[model samples]
Target: FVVRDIRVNGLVRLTPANVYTMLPINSGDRVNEPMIAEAIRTLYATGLFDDIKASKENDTLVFNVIERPIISKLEFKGNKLIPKEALEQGLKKMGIAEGEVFKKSALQTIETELEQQYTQQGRYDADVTVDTVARPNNRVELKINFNEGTPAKVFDINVIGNTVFKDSEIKQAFAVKESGWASVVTRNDRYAREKMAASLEALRAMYLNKGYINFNINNSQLNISEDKKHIFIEVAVDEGSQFKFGQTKFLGDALYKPEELQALKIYKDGDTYSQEKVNAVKQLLLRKYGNAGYYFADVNIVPQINNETGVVDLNYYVNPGQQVTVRR
Candidate 1:
């Protein structure tokens, strides 16, 4: 049927302009079954309507749409690990803020995001549920309830695949510790993802500083107890051959004096390859360039490894872009 005009119904808060903009058919457009189906699909993709039906009344195309309810208010209950303000900010970012159209999909997304946040904080047993209470004027009040369960504590930690360093010495590098008397005040036993990540980096640095230049973590495993109150962690690593510092070279336009740039070298020949010392040299060069008005400086460290001799040559590539002056 040819569309002579388009009419929309079941609109409360939405204007005719809102519905018209989503429709593919116009007042004088020729439409068939395929076009009508396409128009319905397009309208549904907008997420503004809960239900939509299209029909032809003589020559006029009609759209009957049920607008989704607006969120009048938002509330959170039984939330202790996450603050109310933070939850509200997260909801705002997820497009579930008050005064916005309520979407059913947003509820599940909010739950997943909240669960992830809780998991990062070591609350593996946390659960989130949502409730919607319909109000007058096509509005709804949403309540988010959180059962923030007790955080899992580290019961034990094991490190595998090490021969040079003792297990006790390697465990010293970890910030997450097994529960003990000191954990009461230090809270080191709390299994936070960020803390664990930092601990892993610390372990890597520990091996790298001691000449394990090719050190690699094969796998880091976390085992949760049946009751979800305790966690066991195992970090398996492959400590490759140790290497000694062989040589150092600098590459780039000399923005600073040669002697000044050479002074940034911390590692010397015959010294064990230390990632910490290499990073220190990079920081020193960065600070020197940054203080000299070169704000956008790129300092890259390139390592040339000789496996047979177990020696690593270092190269510092500096790219100092256009200088900029700071204004007060």
Candidate 2:
């Protein structure tokens, strides 16, 4: 059928011009079922209409659409941890600004994001709710309520499966700790996932520095109290046999004489393997090569561990790329 004219109805806030921009059919254009279907899809993608219907009245194409409500104002209640201005700014980023068309689905997304922000701060019991109040002139007032629950505290911390080191020694390395009289100042008892992860890394470094080269964390679990007020952290570690320093040798083209390089040794034979000393030697050798204009020198410390003798043989492999002259 041929469309002689196009008209739009049921528009309270949006004008005919706005509807015309999204429509594919114009006056005097031939349109079929497929074209109507495609036009309907394109209009729906604009997210402006709640209900849309198209009909043929004589030779004219008639479109009736219900425009979504515009957000006239936004209000936040019971949000103490996150400032009201901050929450409004976050909503603006999500396309939920004042005077903009409000999408119902975006409200759910905003709620989820707000909850996640609180969770990251250790507020596992936080809650967020959104409500919409219709106003005159096709506008709405959105109200966001936040219940910022108390952050969970560490009630107790325990380490298991560690035989070489005492519990006190391992606990001293942790950044997170159980609540105590001193916690009133340190606040170390706060249960934050990032702090917990950093504490784990510190434990690993401590073990490695003590010659426990094969040490590994077997498992870690966090148990929350029934009231969600406190958390219990349990970490299991496998501290393998300690290793001693065995033979040490350089395994690459010597940028310096053997005597000069041997003078940089920080570890002696039969001493407990210290990763810290090994790293220090690496930096010392790199600095020596770098002073000679070998800026791209790479050093790799390879360790060959003998399980039977509990000794690790160290080999320092150096690769010096093309040398360059320094210009002042």
Instruction: Name the regions of candidate 1 deviating beyond 4 angstroms.
Output: 1-154, 177-192, 260-265, 325-328
**Which candidate ranks first by lDDT, i.e. highest?**
1
Per-model TM-score, in order, reads 0.47, 0.48
Query: C-alpha displacement of 300 in model 1, angstroms?
Result: 1.2
**Model 2, 327: alpha-carbon shift in Å?**
99
lDDT of 1 by residue, 124-211 (tens): 5678998999999889998989987655565577888888888777668775433331223233446355556777898998899999
Q: Which ten residues in a row have the lowest lDDT in candidate 1?
A: 178-187
Tell me the whole-model lDDT of each prediction, alpha carbons only: 0.78, 0.78
Clashes of each: 0, 0
Candidate 2 backbone collisions, by pair: none
